[PDB]
Write a protein that binds this DNA or RNA. Structure first.
Lengths: 116, 242, 294, 108
RNA sequence: GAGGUGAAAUUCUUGGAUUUAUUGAAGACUAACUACUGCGAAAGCAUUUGCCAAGGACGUUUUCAUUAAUCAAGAACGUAGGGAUCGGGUGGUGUUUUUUUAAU
RNA sequence: UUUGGACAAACUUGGUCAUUUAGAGGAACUAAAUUCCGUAGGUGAACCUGCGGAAGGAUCAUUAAAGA
């Protein structure tokens, strides 16, 4: 018997977010960023920064009790890159390694229908 | 970030150290409607069941976007995730109902290619209940067998005919049904084959899908009807011993 | 909402209400003659301050009285003379008001980024801002110091120097940083403002600094006196003979030409005189020694 | 996605090589004639400018009709991406050759 | 902590910034389909549905009988050959289609 | 109205002591190895903000068969 969170891995520019939520979407669990692990302000979008960020999220979520994670990668959307950078795959590799069962990898990046 | 960066006049406001909320949170599990199989879809944190913004009414608004392969156990539709609105909380089990449906975007982004034209349709239709749906439909031109030309384009006066007949027949398929019946006839993907059978006369029409059902107005609660969609239940005694 | 005062092991003495949450600095006189002080100067996040009076003992006394003729947000600092207190804050507002009808007497703006603290001694004003320098007022612009980043708080040390905090380290005044902390600091406390304590605090760690290493210049004078003593006795031994302790002083001072001459004379004595290759005292004297000067 | 199979094996072994992707359409909005100029300018002649960026910044790129992909190490991805976005803004290839000589000097 | 860059910085943020979810409002635009394809006198023109007129090609054993062209002034708007494709028509004769509801 | 009053923050003149001065001498000692036009804006021209435009700027892999 396993229970499921939802990753919502944000592969932004100049930053990376990982925060697993229970699969409604309200009760977020352990928001981390790329900034709050590294100390340089130059590579707060580092793949290594996202790696240990996802490691700390995996530790806190195993502490709470969720074992599998439906993972959803979101790029910055809008009229911008529309496609995950390197930090998304870095966090994905990290929390796929770190003892956490992974389900239903997707892409929830917004598409504009030709906005401004 | 670190120690050498900045204080930035926002860290002077002090931190309000620890609340440890996961010792206070509470686990519920979700029961899907009985049109599907495997109605247990997972668990949800809420809050502690106290008064003054209680749990049973801080609940009952949310949605859960579960996958149809996770509901049916069959990987023939790994796409087409649905959204269940949690509606009636009843004894640790969130009884939910249907709220929407959408394709995972990789499926349609791999379906659409060039050298074919795609058709869209969408109607606002009331069911036999008082739900109203902006139900959608996507369609694609089939490269006919024994073809030679690279094109396979629709004449754009066939497009009005295909869109008219597809809006007419799925308007009929909604209006002759209730919402539970609409889910139980949308799950084994049968209005797609109905569109292809009633529309292969005019054009060859590669794979048809519906890809979106958006609810826009809900009738009422009808607690008894929602309990009828799952199974009955009567919460009764536990021993006092004091 | 509040700001309260505690008197007597302690206990509550007087609550004080009426603000927007009072998230700010307080201040007391440094002149108290009777058995109770009479000026509580608090600031607020109403962009205002409030002076009031702490009344007589043997009560509870939750009151609110005197004006808010003010900015209308941190770092309130009181005088030993209690004629002028300081309220420097909030993007280069270095104002000083008069513990009375509070006029706008000599407001200053010579900084670049937001202010962080202001302090001034019992013994003549020093503020500290986000310009990573600390500046000294009298009037106008006496001095500044400057280091790495974001000087949080400063304090005068006993007449004329001052110690500043929170670059990553408690630095005195340039000369003499003290860098035993890791993260940010909001703490600087002295005993009698020139004497043997100053306590500072990081997020977690306490650093108690005893300021009792100014006998180190005394023992450094003792070191130089020792050096000239067993340097001149080397010349005395070279001129008087008894080459053994002359060798000892020459080796401990590493004077190589006098070393060469002292053991040349020792060697000539050993060739002239009559297991043993120098005089035997010098033999055991180089026998005993340790490794580094060996 | 479009790299060759030895390049994908190079992603399989030595796990710290990631794969960035972006589009032509994000910068300067690139109407179709200028888009043809853009992909012809990035490919050069007989793939020579693309192979120059490949051998210079220790990474390997592939490019579809409007969306390109670079795989390698992360700061080499960033170096190749800034050289590509300068070239797609439109620069003399001699100037981007000199810039890549400087970036190869940073590489050594 | 967020932003932002080659690094920064400004700014925002414990009155909860970024992110997450449920909505609601506002204007603009019509992602992929998109091509050496379509239209319009030209500039230009891409969501659906309806109305209002117009236009082009084709079809034609229908009518009129030189009504044509060319432009100042003025006016409105701003050398021969072959393959493939789009629109229309004719013929062929296989699969898609289907049959007493209409259509083609 | 002060019956009447020690004092009382700041000042005047001198002294008393100290701080740096600021540079100018004197005379001692120690040390001394990508381009351009039109519409609009301002920077002195250029150049630049934003829009419509012509590249006279140099296309490599990938392409309709799949037999569970």
């Amino acid at each position: 018997s396993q229970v499921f969170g939802v990753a919502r891995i944000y592969a932004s520019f100049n930053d990376t977010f990982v925060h697993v939520t229970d699969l409604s979407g309200k009760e977020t669990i352990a928001r981390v960023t790329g900034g709050m692990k590294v100390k340089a302000d130059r590579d707060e979008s580092s793949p290594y920064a996202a790696m240990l960020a996802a490691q700390d999220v995996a530790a806190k979520c195993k502490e709470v009790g969720i074992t599998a994670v439906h993972v959803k990668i979101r790029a910055t959307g809008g009229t911008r890159t529309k496609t995950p950078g390197p930090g998304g795959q870095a966090a994905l590799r990290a929390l796929a390694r770190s003892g956490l069962r992974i389900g239903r990898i997707e892409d929830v990046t917004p598409v504009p229908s030709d906005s401004t | 970030v670190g120690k050498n960066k900045r204080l930035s006049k926002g860290k002077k406001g002090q931190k309000k150290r620890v609340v440890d909320p996961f010792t206070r949170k509470e686990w519920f599990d979700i029961k899907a409607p009985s049109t599907f199989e495997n109605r247990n879809v997972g668990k949800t944190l809420v809050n502690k069941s106290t008064g003054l913004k209680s749990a049973s009414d801080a609940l009952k608004g949310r949605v859960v976007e579960v996958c149809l392969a996770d509901l049916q156990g069959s990987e023939d539709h790994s796409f087409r995730k649905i959204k269940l609105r949690v509606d009636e909380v009843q004894g640790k089990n969130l009884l939910t109902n249907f709220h929407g449906m959408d394709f995972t975007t990789d499926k349609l982004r791999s379906m659409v290619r060039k050298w074919q034209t795609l058709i869209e349709a969408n109607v606002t239709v009331k069911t036999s209940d008082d739900y109203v749906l902006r139900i959608f439909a996507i369609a694609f031109t089939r490269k006919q067998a024994n073809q030679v030309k690279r094109h396979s384009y629709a004449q754009s006066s066939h497009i009005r005919a295909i869109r008219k007949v597809i809006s007419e027949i799925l308007t009929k398929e909604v209006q002759g049904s209730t919402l539970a019946q609409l889910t139980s006839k949308l799950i084994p993907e049968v209005i797609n084959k109905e569109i292809e059978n009633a529309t292969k006369d005019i054009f060859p029409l590669q794979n048809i899908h519906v890809r979106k059902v958006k609810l826009l107005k809900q009738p009422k609660f009808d607690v008894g009807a929602l309990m009828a969609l799952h199974g009955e239940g009567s919460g009764e005694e536990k021993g006092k011993k004091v | 909402n509040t700001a309260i005062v505690w008197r007597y092991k302690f206990d509550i003495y007087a609550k004080y209400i009426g603000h927007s949450a009072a998230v700010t600095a307080v201040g007391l006189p440094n002149i108290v003659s009777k058995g109770y002080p009479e000026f509580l100067l608090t600031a607020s996040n109403d962009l205002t301050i409030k002076k009031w009076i702490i009344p007589k003992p043997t009560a509870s006394m939750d009151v609110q009285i005197i004006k808010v003729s003010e900015y209308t947000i941190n770092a309130l600092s009181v005088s030993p003379n209690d004629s002028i207190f300081a309220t420097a804050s909030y993007d280069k507002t270095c104002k000083i008001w008069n513990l009375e009808n509070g006029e706008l007497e000599a407001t200053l703006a010579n900084h670049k980024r937001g202010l962080w603290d202001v302090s001034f001694c019992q013994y003549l004003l020093a503020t500290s801002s986000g310009d990573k320098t600390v500046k000294i007022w009298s009037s106008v612009m006496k001095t500044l110091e400057g280091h790495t980043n974001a000087v949080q708080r400063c304090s005068f040390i006993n007449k004329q120097k001052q110690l500043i905090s929170c670059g990553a380290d408690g630095l005195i005044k340039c000369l003499k940083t003290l860098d035993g902390h890791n993260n940010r600091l909001w703490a600087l406390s002295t005993m009698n403002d020139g004497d043997m304590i100053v306590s500072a605090d990081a997020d977690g760690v306490f650093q108690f600094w005893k300021d009792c290493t100014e006998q180190e210049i005394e023992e450094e004078q003792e070191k130089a006196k020792l050096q000239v003593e067993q340097e001149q006795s080397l010349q005395n031994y070279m001129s008087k003979g008894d080459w053994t302790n002359a060798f000892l002083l020459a080796m401990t001072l590493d004077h190589p030409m006098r070393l060469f001459n002292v053991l040349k004379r020792a060697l000539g004595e050993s060739r002239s005189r009559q297991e043993v290759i120098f005089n035997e005292e010098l033999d055991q004297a180089i026998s005993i020694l340790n490794d580094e000067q060996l | 996605l479009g790299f060759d199979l030895d390049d994908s094996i190079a992603l399989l072994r030595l796990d710290d090589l990631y794969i960035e992707t972006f589009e032509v359409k994000d910068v300067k909005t690139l109407t179709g004639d200028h888009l043809s100029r853009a992909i012809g300018r990035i490919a050069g002649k007989d793939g020579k400018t693309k192979f120059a960026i490949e051998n210079a910044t220790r990474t390997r790129i592939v490019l579809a009709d409007s969306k390109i992909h670079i795989l390698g190490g992360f700061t080499h991805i960033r170096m190749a991406r800034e050289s590509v976005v300068s070239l797609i803004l439109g620069s003399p290839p001699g100037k981007v050759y000199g810039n890549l000589r400087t970036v190869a000097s940073r590489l050594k």
